Structures are given as C-alpha cells and as structure tokens.
Coordinates of C-alpha atoms and ligand atoms in Angstrom, one line a residue:
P1 CA -33.7 -0.8 -1.3
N2 CA -35.3 -2.8 1.6
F3 CA -32.1 -2.7 3.6
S4 CA -34.0 -1.3 6.5
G5 CA -34.8 -3.7 9.2
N6 CA -33.6 -5.9 12.1
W7 CA -31.0 -8.5 11.1
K8 CA -29.8 -11.6 13.0
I9 CA -26.7 -13.5 12.0
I10 CA -26.8 -17.1 10.8
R11 CA -23.2 -17.6 9.5
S12 CA -19.9 -15.9 10.4
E13 CA -16.6 -17.2 9.0
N14 CA -13.1 -16.5 7.9
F15 CA -13.1 -14.2 10.9
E16 CA -10.0 -15.4 12.7
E17 CA -7.8 -15.2 9.6
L18 CA -8.9 -11.6 9.1
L19 CA -7.8 -10.8 12.7
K20 CA -4.5 -12.6 12.1
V21 CA -3.6 -10.1 9.3
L22 CA -3.4 -7.3 12.0
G23 CA -1.7 -9.2 14.8
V24 CA -4.6 -10.0 17.0
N25 CA -3.5 -12.7 19.5
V26 CA -4.9 -16.2 19.3
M27 CA -7.0 -15.7 22.5
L28 CA -8.2 -12.3 21.6
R29 CA -8.9 -13.8 18.2
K30 CA -11.0 -16.6 19.6
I31 CA -13.0 -14.4 21.9
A32 CA -13.4 -12.0 19.0
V33 CA -14.7 -14.9 16.9
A34 CA -17.3 -15.8 19.5
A35 CA -18.3 -12.2 20.0
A36 CA -18.5 -11.6 16.2
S37 CA -20.8 -14.7 16.1
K38 CA -23.5 -12.9 18.2
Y39 CA -23.7 -9.8 16.0
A40 CA -27.0 -8.1 15.4
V41 CA -27.6 -5.4 12.8
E42 CA -30.3 -2.7 12.7
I43 CA -30.6 -0.7 9.4
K44 CA -32.6 2.4 8.6
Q45 CA -32.3 3.3 4.9
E46 CA -33.8 6.5 3.4
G47 CA -32.8 6.8 -0.3
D48 CA -29.0 7.1 -0.2
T49 CA -28.9 7.8 3.6
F50 CA -28.1 5.0 6.0
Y51 CA -28.2 4.5 9.7
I52 CA -26.6 1.1 10.8
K53 CA -26.4 -0.1 14.4
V54 CA -24.3 -3.2 14.8
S55 CA -24.1 -4.7 18.3
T56 CA -22.6 -7.6 20.1
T57 CA -23.2 -8.7 23.7
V58 CA -21.2 -6.0 25.4
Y59 CA -20.6 -3.5 22.6
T60 CA -22.7 -1.5 20.2
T61 CA -21.7 1.0 17.5
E62 CA -23.6 3.3 15.1
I63 CA -22.7 4.8 11.7
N64 CA -24.6 7.3 9.6
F65 CA -23.6 8.0 6.0
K66 CA -24.7 9.0 2.6
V67 CA -23.7 7.1 -0.5
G68 CA -20.9 9.1 -2.2
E69 CA -20.2 11.2 0.9
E70 CA -17.1 10.7 3.0
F71 CA -17.6 10.0 6.7
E72 CA -15.6 8.7 9.6
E73 CA -15.5 5.3 11.2
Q74 CA -13.1 2.7 12.6
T75 CA -11.3 -0.2 10.9
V76 CA -11.5 -3.6 12.3
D77 CA -8.7 -2.8 14.8
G78 CA -10.2 0.5 15.9
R79 CA -8.0 2.8 13.8
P80 CA -10.0 5.9 12.7
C81 CA -10.5 6.2 9.0
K82 CA -12.4 8.1 6.4
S83 CA -14.8 6.0 4.3
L84 CA -16.7 6.3 1.0
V85 CA -19.5 4.0 0.0
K86 CA -20.5 3.4 -3.6
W87 CA -23.1 1.2 -5.3
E88 CA -22.0 -1.8 -7.2
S89 CA -25.4 -2.9 -8.3
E90 CA -29.0 -2.4 -7.2
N91 CA -28.5 -4.1 -3.8
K92 CA -24.8 -4.2 -3.1
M93 CA -22.7 -1.4 -1.8
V94 CA -18.9 -1.3 -1.3
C95 CA -17.0 0.9 1.2
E96 CA -13.4 1.9 0.7
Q97 CA -11.4 3.0 3.8
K98 CA -8.2 5.0 4.1
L99 CA -6.3 5.3 7.4
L100 CA -6.3 8.9 8.8
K101 CA -2.8 8.4 10.3
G102 CA 0.0 6.2 9.3
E103 CA 0.1 2.9 7.4
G104 CA -1.5 -0.5 7.7
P105 CA -3.5 -2.9 5.6
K106 CA -5.9 -1.9 2.9
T107 CA -9.4 -2.5 4.3
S108 CA -12.9 -2.4 2.8
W109 CA -16.4 -3.7 3.5
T110 CA -19.5 -4.6 1.5
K111 CA -23.2 -5.0 2.2
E112 CA -25.7 -6.8 0.0
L113 CA -29.4 -7.8 -0.1
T114 CA -29.8 -11.0 -1.9
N115 CA -33.0 -12.1 -3.7
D116 CA -33.4 -14.8 -1.1
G117 CA -33.8 -12.1 1.5
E118 CA -30.4 -12.4 3.1
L119 CA -28.1 -9.6 4.1
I120 CA -24.5 -10.4 3.3
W121 CA -21.7 -8.4 4.9
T122 CA -18.1 -8.8 3.9
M123 CA -15.0 -7.2 5.3
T124 CA -11.6 -7.3 3.6
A125 CA -8.0 -6.8 4.8
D126 CA -5.5 -7.2 2.0
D127 CA -5.9 -10.7 0.6
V128 CA -8.3 -11.8 3.4
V129 CA -12.1 -11.6 3.3
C130 CA -14.5 -12.2 6.2
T131 CA -18.2 -12.8 5.4
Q132 CA -21.3 -12.7 7.6
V133 CA -24.9 -13.6 6.6
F134 CA -28.0 -12.4 8.3
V135 CA -31.8 -13.0 8.0
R136 CA -34.6 -10.6 8.9
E137 CA -35.5 -10.9 12.6
Ligands
RET1 C1 -23.3 -4.1 8.5 C2 -22.1 -4.2 9.3 C3 -21.7 -5.3 10.1 C4 -22.4 -6.6 10.0 C5 -20.6 -5.1 10.9 C6 -20.0 -6.1 11.7 C7 -18.8 -5.8 12.5 C8 -18.1 -6.7 13.2 C9 -18.3 -8.2 13.2 C10 -16.9 -6.3 13.9 C11 -16.1 -7.0 14.6 C12 -14.8 -6.7 15.4 C13 -14.1 -5.6 15.3 C14 -14.4 -4.5 14.4 C15 -13.1 -5.3 16.3 C16 -13.4 -5.8 17.7 C17 -13.7 -7.2 17.7 C18 -14.8 -7.7 16.6 C19 -14.4 -9.1 16.2 C20 -16.2 -7.8 17.3

C-alpha cells in the first residue's frame, strides 16, 4: 500500500525485444532503450485510486485510475486503449489493455512493491516481457 512516492530506475531490460514485436526500427529502438533507461516514476496512491506520473528526459505522461474501473491510456506504440487494473496479491497489480480501434498484439502491464522496497514494473506484448526496477528516491 506504500506505492506512493518518488521512484528512480536501477534496471531496464528486454526493452528492445518488446519494441521489435511492433515494428520499431533498430535506431528508434536503440534511442528508445536509452530513453527508457532514464525513466522516473511518481506515484500517489489513496486506497484503490492511483496517480502515476512517468517521465523521461523530454516526455512525461500521467495516468489516473481506480482499481476495477476502466480508463483510457496508450499502448507502448501510442495506440489508445481502454485498461482495467486488478490486484493479484497485496502488492502487485495487473493491467489488461484492449485496443479501441483495430487489431494488434495483446498488451498488459504490472506493478509490484517487493518486501525489499523495490518497485517492479513489467510490460508485456504477446510472448515478450519487459521489466523495470526502481528504488525510492
Ligand atoms: C509505472 C509505469 C512505468 C514505469 C512506465 C514506463 C513506461 C515506459 C518505459 C514507456 C516507454 C516507451 C513507450 C511507451 C513508447 C515511446 C518510447 C518508450 C520506449 C519511452
């Protein structure tokens, strides 16, 4: 329940192979990998209500949602989707996404607070899972 806080990244991996699944170019993949490696996360949690600001060097994005309540966001490659977060356990939530227009890969993300005090974020596209690890700032 202590998801709230300021998180700085310490590990980011399998990122390029997630981007490959969609057709991101090698160059755009590489600069995406470097960008993804500077991510910062700001979380404000109030019960089942979440504000998450994730930012890189030149881009920042916010989401607000309630567990169980569909909301709108963007997949990895910017396609708008409706999303639904559910709890898996005390400190891990899973988010299913469904494309609002057309077809594409099945995408989903997770967030978890470990007992070591790490925030683990994963993002999935079909068979492929990226993972990022953060510590409190
Ligand atoms: C809790 C949520 C987190 C840690 C979200 C992190 C999001 C990213 C690392 C997103 C990365 C990318 C895209 C969605 C598309 C544009 C390029 C990237 C690689 C920065």
